[PDB]
Amino acid sequence: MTHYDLAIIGSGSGNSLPDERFDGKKIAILEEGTFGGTCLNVGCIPTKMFVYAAEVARTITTAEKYGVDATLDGVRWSDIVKRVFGRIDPISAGGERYRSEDSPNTTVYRGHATFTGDKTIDTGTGETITADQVVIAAGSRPIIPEEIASSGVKYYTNEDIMRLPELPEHLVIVGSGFIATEFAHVFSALGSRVSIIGRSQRLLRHLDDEISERFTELAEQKWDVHLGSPLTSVRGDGDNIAVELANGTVVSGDVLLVAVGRQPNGDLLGLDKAGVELDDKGSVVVDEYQRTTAEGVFALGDVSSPYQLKHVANHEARVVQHNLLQDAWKDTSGLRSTDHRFVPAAVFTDPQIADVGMTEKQARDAGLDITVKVQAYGDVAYGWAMEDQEGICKVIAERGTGRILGAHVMGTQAPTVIQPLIQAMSFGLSAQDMARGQYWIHPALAEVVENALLGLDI
Amino acid sequence: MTHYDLAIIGSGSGNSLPDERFDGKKIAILEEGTFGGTCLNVGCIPTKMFVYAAEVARTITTAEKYGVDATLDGVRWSDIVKRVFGRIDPISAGGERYRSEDSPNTTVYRGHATFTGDKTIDTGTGETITADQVVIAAGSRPIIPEEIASSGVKYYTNEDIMRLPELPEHLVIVGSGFIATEFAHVFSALGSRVSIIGRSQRLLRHLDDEISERFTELAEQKWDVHLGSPLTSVRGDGDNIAVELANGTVVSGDVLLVAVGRQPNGDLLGLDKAGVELDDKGSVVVDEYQRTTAEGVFALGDVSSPYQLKHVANHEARVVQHNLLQDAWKDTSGLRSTDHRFVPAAVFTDPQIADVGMTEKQARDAGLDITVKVQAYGDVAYGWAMEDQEGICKVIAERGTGRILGAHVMGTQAPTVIQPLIQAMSFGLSAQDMARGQYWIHPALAEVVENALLGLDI
Ligand SMILES: Cc1cc2nc3c(=O)[nH]c(=O)nc-3n(C[C@H](O)[C@H](O)[C@H](O)COP(=O)(O)OP(=O)(O)OC[C@H]3O[C@@H](n4cnc5c(N)ncnc54)[C@H](O)[C@@H]3O)c2cc1C
Ligand SMILES: Cc1cc2nc3c(=O)[nH]c(=O)nc-3n(C[C@H](O)[C@H](O)[C@H](O)COP(=O)(O)OP(=O)(O)OC[C@H]3O[C@@H](n4cnc5c(N)ncnc54)[C@H](O)[C@@H]3O)c2cc1C
């Protein structure tokens, strides 16, 4: 057996750990799929490249309301797929080389890793290795309902849909999460009619109810939305696919995209042989120092975190990287803890949505004395420039102190507009201070935040 | 003579002064032109409404770089003018109503006001009034070169160009400031040929040298740029206008736009009769209490401020309004001081520009030990989604402390992207904390700021 000071399962956020301070130690990296993890190859980055092209198309079909006449002649889907992965694939693959060929003290294994012992890992390549410390960066994988993975019909996930040969005439999406609603926006804007099937009574059910409700009402005018009904059976009739719901409705289309959720891959690693505890949802249990229940074993990313988000896994990687070099199970004094406090999320759909902190419901359930202002985009000068009638910025702050508790933006550049709120929240800045203690450029999209704060009572 | 507790010259930011705390006080408002001041009617608001339509036109003409085929059929200038001012004039006039219709104890004068005495004001309507306190909100007026306003040729300024009946085939602009380059962006994107004549060797001379330099290179590939030689004569040959420069070049076109700068309106008020001091360029002299040299008189806005910016003038009104109600010339303890420190500016041209703090030159001339990072838009995942090759985020931070001293962004949504820097600066937030002490949404335009901070040397 080959011994290492460090073994890393997962080339996602796991690849960000080895830097200069580790040069004197030999590292083993295990990657069963594409190099670079879900984020680079089939997730955050390539998705938003399609979203951008879809937003350009939306600009064109709506240009009349601004007094500019234009026609959307067509979309070259193949050339879009060509352009996106024409940049993604050389990058994923350039890093794979770096780790296996420059490899100053690194060894890459291309197999499914599995714990056979304490720090004993079957590589899936026919080898077994040992490590002084191990980091689990196994991420998550799409959840496929049994009704789909038994019918025998062709279905898609984020792992292949972005590489379709042609644009589907009718896309049927199973799911109401951010993956489903982002793909609905991408495809519908480019020319596909999208049908979305949701189990819940709203799309993006788990967001603030005012955001979830209004987006659903806007979505109903853009896509064929079917809520409240779980699917019951799937039937493939040639190239056409039919999906039967519990209420009896049958949704037929060209391509079936499954986006019902993601499952952390901890259950695939044989963690029981390593003494790594799994909780009730399949995430590996770690502490504020990302140290698991097992010695010398850390975890990060979708395999452990409650927020299956890249910027979270990257933050935790900074913590693991530092805690890796000290006396982890001996000295907590030199250890850094992970800050899981003001985690933002974004949905790149139309309208685009971003959040951070608590929903208004969550604020009241905690029994908080709050003030709330929902500011309309079309009420600031920049919102008029856009002739906006959908955008809102809802800020929930606390009465008396002005301590902001949450912010929810639905509208253009939502993931960027919220950043001043993320910033003020993360550093304890009061809302009355954020409004008046700085200048806001007039007139820019930013002014919606300022007026949201100015409309807040105390 | 009619006596008042307060007289206000200027319906721009001056109209924002009377609130609830003045209900028991009689107020006189003097406005010689259109109600609402420059920003609402011929300035801040209507320009950015045109700029957005120009961004729609640009999106369509460049959309193929994303794999979307579209044609710019035409531009409906008349329909642009109606849509912009179709909401602007009912608002200006709705506000004119409110002050004469709600008017609890307020009187509006539509005439050119001039100080004839201490606090004695000729209304320009044939009356003379006095007030216990006076606020000057007279703003500024366009500067017209003598060669232009003597030639007898028809010329336009920002006060009428947005009300042209038709789109000019070839627009000739005299100026290199933010007004010239915003209008250069507006017309060229909509179909006009644009010639820009600047006396300087760069457009936007007053920006960070790297920002001004790259923007000029980009402008030169979009417009007919004439640098380094001042104009000498203007001669009209029918409807066509020809402008001769000092080097001998003659730039001819159909429409002449003058955008060389603005002059504060202090010189027109007969101010010496009031003992209100004017400095060396014509702004009314005030202190941190917006107090002029004469008792009972304040000033604000473009008529006094060094920053002829709306968000500044609105802030100064907040100070004047509060200090108006106390004994400013007796007890400074209860008074509001104006914060003129982290004033941002933005130019809504192609590419969009925003700045705050110190330029690299200003930082070095001030003898600070600085570090600089110029981050390109196309280096974060969102820059790939746009296929950006022009955007930059330049951050100037101090070595050792990481305290930011300046930030300069050229690219999409520059006035919104920069706001986290304005905020972090305004509350003394360091780069080391701002970068890592908060979460940034992946992948959004915001990440360009994050990596700019990550690239700073200490
Ligand atoms: C469609 C989609 C869109 C997304 N959009 C966003 C977004 O906008 N913003 C955001 O912040 N996040 C987004 N995410 C989430 C982000 O892509 C991931 O959550 C992120 O990569 C988490 O990092 P990770 O390394 O833990 O996961 P991963 O990147 O999946 O890393 C896990 C790695 O381990 C490997 N592995 C698994 N099992 C084995 C084994 N047995 N042996 C060897 N190797 C193995 C996998 O091949 C993979 O390379 C998105 C995800 C998806 C699917
Ligand atoms: C084209 C353009 C674009 C701009 N864009 C921006 C931008 O994006 N952001 C920004 O922050 N700033 C911008 N500005 C600057 C902005 O217009 C000013 O900073 C702001 O309007 C200052 O407000 P004010 O009330 O002091 O000036 P004004 O709005 O001009 O108010 C002065 C008013 O007083 C009246 N008046 C003058 N003299 C007399 C008199 N003797 N008697 C009676 N009434 C009188 C005038 O008619 C006018 O209505 C722009 C300016 C222009 C010209």
Residue numbers in the entry:
A (entry chain B), B (entry chain A): 1 to 458
Quote the study on this structure.
The NADPH-dependent FAD-containing oxidoreductase mycothiol disulfide reductase (Mtr) is known to reduce oxidized mycothiol disulfide (MSSM) to MSH, which is crucial to maintain the cellular redox balance. Mtr belongs to a group of NAD(P)H-dependent homodimeric oxidoreductases with a tightly bound flavin adenine dinucleotide (FAD) cofactor per subunit. The crystal structures of Mtr Re and Mtr Ms confirm that Mtr is a homodimer, as also supported by molecular-weight estimations during protein purification.
Two structures of Mtrs from homologous Actinobacteria are presented in this work; Mtr Ms from the M. tuberculosis model organism M. smegmatis and Mtr Re from R. erythropolis, a biocatalyst used for the bioremediation of toxic compounds. The conserved and redox-active Cys pair responsible for substrate reduction is located on the si face of the isoalloxazine ring of FAD, with the cysteines (Cys39 and Cys44) forming a disulfide bond. Structural comparison of Mtr (Mtr Re ) with deposited PDB structures using the DALI protein structure comparison server shows that Mtr is highly similar to other disulfide oxidoreductases.
